[model samples]
Target: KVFGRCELAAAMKRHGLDNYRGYSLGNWVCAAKFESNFNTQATNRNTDGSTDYGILQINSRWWCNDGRTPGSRNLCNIPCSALLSSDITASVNCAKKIVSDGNGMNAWVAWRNRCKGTDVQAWIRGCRL
Candidate 1:
C-alpha cells in the first residue's frame, strides 16, 4: 500500500530511522518522497540497466540482488523482490545499512537533489514522532 506522508514517517521511525546516522525523520521522509512517492512497489530502471527498488529506491547494483543487474554486489544481502513489499522492514533495514556506509544518505541522488540541506520539517510536521 502507498503511505501518506505522516504514515510513512511513523513507519520509518518505528524502524529506528528516526535520527539514524544523525539524519532526522524529516530527512528520511524527504528522501522517500522524492525517491518513490511512498510507493512500496516503486521501481525505476537506470541507464546502466540496474533497477532501484522500493520507497527508498535501494539499487540493484550495490544493494539488493535483483538477478538482472550485472555485477551486482548485493551489499544489503536481500532480494530485490523483498524491497517491493508493503512491509518496509527490509527496506528500512537496508536503508540503514546504506546510511552506515561511508557515502551515507548522499548515496541516493534523490536525497542529494531534493532532500539534503533542505528544510525537511514539513515532511514530519504533523507526525507525532
Candidate 2:
C-alpha cells in the first residue's frame, strides 16, 4: 500500500486535479504526503471515533462513509471505500467538491497544519507531471 509520489502526481494530472478547486497541485500533493503518505488504503481512527479515509484522508465524520460509522455529514456523498483505491478517481472528485465549498485546502487538517506555508516542491520533485 505504498503509493508512489510520481504515481500520485500522474493520477492527479490525468484527473485534472492539479488545478481542481483553484488550489495549487503542490499543496494538494503535499497534503497527501502527511495525510496518508499517499497510501490509498490508509485509515486512522480519531479520538473522536470518526475515521479518516484515503490519500487525502477524507474524514468519515465530515465526508464519506463506509456504512459502519455513525453521524456523517457525507459532504462528498461517496462511500469511504471508493476513496481507498489505486485509481484515486473518486477521491479527487470528492476533494474538488470539498475545496470548492470555500474551504480551500483547509478542508484537510493535514494540509492546513503541515503543508501550509511550507516549501513542498519536494512532494513532486522530479515527477514528469
Candidate 3:
C-alpha cells in the first residue's frame, strides 16, 4: 500500500504514534516519508546482510527475525514479513518498542538524517489529525 502523506499520518495516529516517545506525529510522518516513501511493502537490504521491512522499515538486526540477519535478537519477536502489511499494526508496535528502549527516533538513520531538528510540521500539514 502506498499511502498519501495525510493518509499515512492518520493511520499512524490510530496506532498512537502521535507524539509517541516524545517525538511529534510529524516526525514519524517524515521518517516514513524518507524510510519507505509510504509504501507498506517496501524493503531494503542493508550492507550488513540485514533487511528493513515495511513502512517504518523495521529492521531484522535486532527487531524482526527474518532468518537471514545473522545474530538478530528479534526483540520484537515477530517475523519481518509481518511488517509488510498495510495494516501497520506490527510495525507500529515494534517501532514503539524500539523508541521506548532508549533508542528513540535515532533507531532509524533516515529519521536522524532527514527528520531530526527539521521543521517537521509540513509533513503533517492538512492531515487533520
Candidate 4:
C-alpha cells in the first residue's frame, strides 16, 4: 500500500479532500488502488522515449521544468523513476491540485465514470464519507 489509512488520511487532509462532502479515506484508497494499484513508486513508459512517473503518474518531461530562479535546474533534470524519491510529496501535491480544481470532486467522479464505467459512489460500497 502506498500509504496506510491514517497516513493517507493525513495526506488527503493536507490536500483538502476532507473539506468536500462525500469524500473520505475509503474513497481515496479506492481511487489509489484503481489508479496505481496502491503503488506510490509506479511508472509507465511512453512509446516516444518519454515517461510518466510516480503514484499519480506525473509526466516529468512535460510538466517539470527549470526552477524559476537563477542557476536553477529543471525539476525534470532527473530521469523519470518511481515515487521513492524525495519528490513523491511534490507528485502527490500536484495530483491533489488537479483533483481540487474548480470542478472539485467532479473530476474524481468523472475519473470513475471514464476508468471504471460506473458511478463513483458504487465503487465505495458500504463506505460513507
From the highest lDDT down, the ranking of the candidates is: 3, 1, 2, 4
For residues 1-129, write the lDDT of model 3, one tens digit per residue: 999999999988999999887888999999999999999999999999999999999889999999988999999999999999879999999999999987689988999999899999889998677
User: Candidate 2 — which residues are off by over 4 angstroms?
Assistant: none
Point out where model 1 deviates above 4 Å.
none
Superposed on all Cα atoms, the candidates' RMSDs to the truth, in angstroms, are: 0.8, 1.5, 0.8, 6.4
Clashes of 2: 0
lDDT of 4 at 71: 37
C-alpha lDDT score of every prediction, in listed order: 0.92, 0.83, 0.92, 0.50
| lDDT string, candidate 2, 51-73, tens digits | 88889888888789777677878
Give the runs in model 4 whose Cα sits over 4 Å from its true position. Answer: 4-10, 18-30, 65-88, 97-117, 122-129
lDDT of 1: 0.92
TM-score of 3: 0.96
Q: For model 3, what is the error of residue 17's alpha carbon versus the real structure, in angstroms, after optimal superposition?
A: 0.9
What's each prediction's clash count? Answer: 0, 0, 0, 2
The residue pairs that clash in candidate 1, if any, are: none
Q: Rate residue 111 of model 1 by lDDT.
A: 91
Steric clash pairs (candidate 4): 41-83, 66-74
